[PDB]
């Protein structure tokens, strides 16, 4: 027997459903969402890391002129300085006084760390559903973990479970995201080949192992000091190193609805929003004909104690007259009151104690025991605490 039900996308709240197969005794199932996964479809634009300013030994031409060769390298910079007289350990390196030159060449490359220390620039398109949920089937708690697409079926205790498809459609991620180790940031990063010096994206590469790189660092060579062999330069500091200090809190801490952000793959776990359908194909092996059950007559409902709260703060005693010994289902016919007991045992002229939860001060509710209904009168009182540590219906 296929049972279709819709529950809100709220983790930690137990929801009860009445399964009524015609000709068979009613069944009550308790369902609770333990966690809800939203995985977005990603497309890597580029990756950013620390840059390496590769500077070789300067070509000091004694008694002559050196010439710059235009090289096809990222951020390639070249300059020749006239009238240089450099000094070494044992004296002057050159013979001439003013007829010497120094060729200072430089270029920007990806640092050795880029394979380990890097930030990935992703473009989030669409996302999917998928999460797990528990359910008390036949007086035992069972764990069900499946994709919330409404296609992925999972069989637990000979019962087929179909979760989803998700009602919404909200995600904490934007159309452009940035991922560093275990932190995800909603960033409007610069496009590929449009990075600025000193900012996030000053060095852009396709993958941490990629060959060709983009570099905009504003590298300019300076004239060396008097009698000194060195390559002085003016360059904007690493944009990635600066961002790692001035990025702030990630989505894990800033996202609404209490979203938990996980990595590898990047997805949002536990997120309250919208509803979710759940189909349960209960086997006929767990059903019992009505005839095989008992009836009930003259019923009276007395409420000796009631406190309107999030938990079952109400106690109710129901008197009855049963035809025979058997199991009867207990369910509240009022949407404001919820019963803790799913099924109880009856015999003849006896009584039953049930725990109930309600929000109303004056509660007039109908309780369906087996196939017969009884009216309950209750005057519930306010609780001592205004704020509670657990969610309710």
């Amino acid at each position: 027997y296929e049972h279709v039900t819709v529950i809100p996308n709220t983790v930690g709240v137990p929801y009860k459903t009445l399964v009524n197969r015609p000709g068979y005794s009613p069944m009550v199932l308790e369902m609770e969402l333990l966690s809800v996964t939203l995985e977005p479809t990603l497309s890597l634009d580029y990756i950013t890391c620390e840059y390496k300013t590769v500077i070789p030994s300067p070509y000091v031409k004694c008694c002559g002129t050196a010439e710059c060769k235009d090289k096809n390298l990222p951020d390639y910079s070249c300059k020749v300085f006239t009238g240089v007289y450099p000094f070494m350990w044992g004296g002057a390196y050159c013979f001439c006084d003013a007829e010497n030159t120094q060729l200072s060449e430089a270029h920007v490359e990806k640092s050795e760390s880029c394979k380990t220390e890097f930030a990935s620039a992703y473009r989030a398109h669409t996302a999917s559903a998928s999460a797990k949920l528990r359910v008390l089937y036949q007086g035992n708690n069972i764990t069900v973990t499946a994709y919330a697409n409404g296609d992925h079926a999972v069989t637990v205790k000979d019962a087929k479970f179909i979760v989803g498809p998700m009602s919404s459609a909200w995600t904490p991620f934007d159309n452009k995201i940035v991922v560093y180790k275990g932190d995800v940031y909603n960033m409007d990063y610069p496009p590929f080949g449009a990075g600025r010096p000193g900012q996030f994206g000053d060095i852009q590469s396709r993958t941490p192992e990629s060959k060709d790189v983009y570099a905009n660092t504003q590298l300019v060579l300076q004239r060396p000091a008097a009698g000194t062999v060195h390559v002085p330069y003016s360059q904007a500091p690493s944009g990635f190193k600066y961002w790692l200090k001035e990025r702030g809190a990630s989505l894990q801490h800033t996202a609404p609805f209490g979203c938990q952000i996980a990595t590898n793959p990047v997805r949002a776990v536990n997120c309250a929003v919208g509803n979710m359908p759940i189909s349960i194909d209960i086997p006929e092996a767990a059903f019992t004909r009505v005839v095989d059950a008992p009836s009930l007559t003259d019923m009276s409902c007395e409420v000796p104690a009631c406190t309107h709260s999030s938990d079952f703060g109400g106690v109710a005693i129901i008197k009855y007259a049963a035809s025979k010994k058997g199991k009867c289902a207990v369910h509240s016919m009022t949407n404001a009151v919820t019963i803790r007991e799913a099924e109880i045992e009856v015999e003849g002229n006896s009584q039953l104690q049930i725990s109930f939860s309600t929000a109303l001060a004056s509660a007039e509710f109908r309780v369906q025991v087996c196939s017969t209904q009884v009216h309950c009168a209750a005057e519930c009182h306010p609780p001592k605490d205004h704020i509670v540590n657990y969610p309710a219906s």
């Binding site: 306010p382 605490d385 205004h386």
Partner: protein, 81 residues
Amino acid sequence: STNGTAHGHPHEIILYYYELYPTMTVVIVSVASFVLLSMVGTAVGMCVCARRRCITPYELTPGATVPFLLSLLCCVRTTKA
């Protein structure tokens, strides 16, 4: 938290405001205003109807006075001099 006592009377009624709220009370107040308007409209209609009754006998000649008391407060005071 915020206790929502029952009453009473009224009193507690306003206490519930804190419990489930922003709103609630304002709508009730609007409803009360509408009820007052209905009450006021009825009274205005009643006064016009009272005129409709005193009509005819609005010309002249003896004839109430008379039924002018018993007489919906005008009636009289009205008959006289």
